């Protein structure tokens, strides 16, 4: 269909990779840093959605380098999704709203 | 059928090493992570490391000397852990557990007595 | 690191009689706390997952309760075959770590 819609789709397809790979990669970065937390899978992987959300409740944080760059990757995956489709809502309701203008 | 194999026992001789192995069978998950504890006759349990195979990193517990080093054959789903300049405190038995990535070990080895002694 | 504690060390019940295994975390670990039993001479077997969840396989006589730092696990009418060391494990924060054991004893 249209570009905006298209994107739309591809940025969710593209988060639920992130957040999925993120979930590894977080656990394989923390565990072996004493205190840490983020290193089970299941939890691992609520850890990603909430990044990716910005709620960030503060339940689990990555406490080592790599698994805070991991964690940027995730913020910014789910940031620019969230702000995409927001941008793809706005391309539709343009669009609409030109042809309820007859123009 | 038995998950983890792992050899009945291995002698050594003092300032020697050994590798102990632990064949793998049963579901195998990217996620799968196989931990070494060792157990001395009489005490409890106590972990020495981990290692994840389909990425091959390990870690070990950082409150006791380390004598151990991880590894994992992928292909032959083997994970070997490398005890060396050993001596009797040495001498204890050695199970090898499969972790499925949520913390706990579902699954144990028969455990490798191993003998420090000339 | 956290520290496990398992008091006391012996348990000496009576045949039927339900039992109950002490586990105290040096710090709150939430319920991710898993139960072993090692019979003499055998491997160690998993027997509850995350402080309550069933295993297959297990006798339904088994049960955990806690949360926080206190857990406990108990056996409803205890027989011979539960003769063995009872161990509690963490895996709330890396590294994970073992109770220093208790054993029943009938």
């Known amino acids: 269909s249209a570009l905006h819609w298209r994107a739309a789709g591809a940025a969710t397809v593209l988060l639920v990779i992130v957040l999925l790979a993120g979930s590894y990669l977080a656990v394989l970065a923390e565990r072996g840093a004493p205190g840490a937390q983020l290193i089970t899978y299941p939890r691992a992987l609520w850890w990603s959605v909430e990044t990716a959300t910005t709620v960030g409740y503060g339940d689990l944080y990555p406490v080592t380098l790599w698994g805070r760059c991991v964690a940027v990757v995730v913020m910014v995956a789910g940031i620019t999704s969230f702000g995409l489709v927001t941008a793809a809502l706005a391309t539709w309701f343009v669009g609409r709203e030109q042809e309820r203008r007859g123009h | 059928q038995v998950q983890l194999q792992q050899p009945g026992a291995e002698l050594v001789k003092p300032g020697a090493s050994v590798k102990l192995s632990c064949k793998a069978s049963g579901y195998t998950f990217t996620s799968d992570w196989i931990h070494w504890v060792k157990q001395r006759p009489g005490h409890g349990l106590e972990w020495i490391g981990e290692i994840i195979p389909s990425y091959g990193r390990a870690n070990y517990n950082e409150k006791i000397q380390k004598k151990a080093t991880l590894t994992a054959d992928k292909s032959s789903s083997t994970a070997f852990m490398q005890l060396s300049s050993l001596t009797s405190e040495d001498s204890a038995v050695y199970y090898c557990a499969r972790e499925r990535g949520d913390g706990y070990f579902a699954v144990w080895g028969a455990g490798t007595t191993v003998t420090v002694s000339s | 690191d956290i520290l496990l504690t398992q008091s006391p060390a012996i348990l000496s019940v009576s045949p039927g009689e339900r039992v109950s295994f002490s586990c105290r975390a040096s710090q709150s670990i939430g319920t991710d706390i898993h139960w072993y039993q090692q019979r003499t001479n055998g491997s160690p077997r998993l027997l509850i997952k995350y402080a309550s969840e069933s295993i297959s396989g297990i006798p339904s006589r088994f049960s955990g309760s806690g949360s926080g730092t206190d857990f406990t696990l108990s056996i409803n009418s205890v027989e011979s075959e539960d003769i063995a060391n009872y161990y509690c494990?963490?895996?709330?924060?890396?590294?994970?770590?073992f109770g220093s054991g208790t054993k029943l004893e009938i």
């Open positions: 494990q963490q895996s709330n924060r890396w590294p994970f770590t």
